[PDB]
Amino acid sequence: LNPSCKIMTFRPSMEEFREFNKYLAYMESKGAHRAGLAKVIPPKEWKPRQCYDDIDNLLIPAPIQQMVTGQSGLFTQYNIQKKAMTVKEFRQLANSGKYCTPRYLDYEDLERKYWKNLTFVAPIYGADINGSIYDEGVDEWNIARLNTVLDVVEEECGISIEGVNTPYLYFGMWKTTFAWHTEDMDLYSINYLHFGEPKSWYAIPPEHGKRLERLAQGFFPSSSQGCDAFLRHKMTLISPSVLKKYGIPFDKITQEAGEFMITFPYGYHAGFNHGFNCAESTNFATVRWIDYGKVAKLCTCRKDMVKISMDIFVRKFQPDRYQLWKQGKDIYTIDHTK
Numbered sequence: 001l002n003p004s005c006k007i008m009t010f011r012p013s014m015e016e017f018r019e020f021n022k023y024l025a026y027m028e029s030k031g032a033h034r035a036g037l038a039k040v041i042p043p044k045e046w047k048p049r050q051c052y053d054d055i056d057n058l059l060i061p062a063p064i065q066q067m068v069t070g071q072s073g074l075f076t077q078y079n080i081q082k083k084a085m086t087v088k089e090f091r092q093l094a095n096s097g098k099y100c101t102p103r104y105l106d107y108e109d110l111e112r113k114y115w116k117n118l119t120f121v122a123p124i125y126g127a128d129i130n131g132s133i134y135d136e137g138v139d140e141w142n143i144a145r146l147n148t149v150l151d152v153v154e155e156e157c158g159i160s161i162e163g164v165n166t167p168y169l170y171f172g173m174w175k176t177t178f179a180w181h182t183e184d185m186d187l188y189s190i191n192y193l194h195f196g197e198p199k200s201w202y203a204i205p206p207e208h209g210k211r212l213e214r215l216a217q218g219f220f221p222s223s224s225q226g227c228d229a230f231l232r233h234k235m236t237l238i239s240p241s242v243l244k245k246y247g248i249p250f251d252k253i254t255q256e257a258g259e260f261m262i263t264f265p266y267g268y269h270a271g272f273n274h275g276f277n278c279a280e281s282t283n284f285a286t287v288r289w290i291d292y293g294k295v296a297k298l299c300t301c302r303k304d305m306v307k308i309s310m311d312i313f314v315r316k317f318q319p320d321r322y323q324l325w326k327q328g329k330d331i332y333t334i335d336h337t338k
């Protein structure tokens with residue numbers, strides 16, 4: 001139990017680290033999941049890639065100019081697609097006077113500059129690129145193959161996981177933003193920062209998630225009017241100032257190069273990149289997630305949003321409740337602490 005619900009940081013030895021699934025279980029046994037987010041710093045000797053030089057040549061097919069509109073800690077974000085770009089070209093763009101990180105004293109100061117400068121120059125994010133940049137043969141915490149319940153269902157049972165378990169690359173520059181969200185189907189996610197400047201995160205404990213949603217609904221009654229789960233559009237920014245004022249409990253932490261972040265089922269998070277960087281992420285599941293999956297509020301307003309059938313997971317891992325669940329009689333409220 002982690003009763004404060006504060007974001008925990010783990011520093012495993014190489015032996016404790018080798019097995020991702022085992023380590024995640026250890027993390028949750030210390031109450032890591034109550035914060036909605038955790039940091040894992042792997043041992044210094046562990047390198048998922050020996051040389052990042054070739055990545056400069058990688059193509060970013062569809063870079064995204066992030067346009068923010070709003071005022072005083074409350075913003076909506078929309079994307080404008082830009083020309084394809086190599087990573088080398090993107091790096092040079094990010095480091096130019098227009099797009100580079102401002103001078104700052106410390107992270108708190110930099111955070112302050114972010115919220116103050118959001119509606120000026122629009123940053124460009126190289127987001128959602130299919131792929132992994134781990135060397136072949138790296139078997140520890142390989143984002144491309146984590147072997148979680150998600151992978152078992154896909155391979156043993158022939159069920160479509162939706163490419164929820166496929167790796168994505170994200171090249172950030174200063175001010176590039178990720179709006180408040182939980183993962184598709186309220187899954188876990190894992191995020192590794194390969195190289196470059198940090199990434200700052202805000203997190204809300206799963207046990208206070210509904211309070212963020214309520215606050216969001218108040219500030220964007222428009223958005224809310226058109227969609228039960230509008231936060232899933234990933235367009236809504238709410239500053240910590242606004243959160244503090246309305247008493248939404250949250251925590252913050254900065255991920256540095258070589259660090260893993262793990263977000264947990266129904267753990268709301270958001271944040272921004274400090275400058276040029278490269279992160280790799282995917283979604284994954286555990287048995288504990290199943291109850292979240294069966295109860296997840298989905299996007300009602302679009303066509304192609306991600307929706308995974310929960311039938312196989314309930315049938316295979318919750319056989320005691322399967323029939324009751326299919327009858328609509330599996331009624332419960334989730335203990336985000338267990």
Ligand SMILES: O=C(O)CNC(=O)C(=O)O
Nearest residue numbers: 170178189190191263281
């Ligand atoms: O780095 C980003 O663009 C945001 N990442 C996440 O929301 C995540 O890894 O779960």
Ligand SMILES: [Cl-]
Nearest residue numbers: 102113114117
């Ligand atoms: Cl700035």
Ligand code: NI
Nearest residue numbers: 182183189263
């Ligand atoms: Ni996320």
Ligand SMILES: [Zn+2]
Nearest residue numbers: 227299300301
């Ligand atoms: Zn929607």
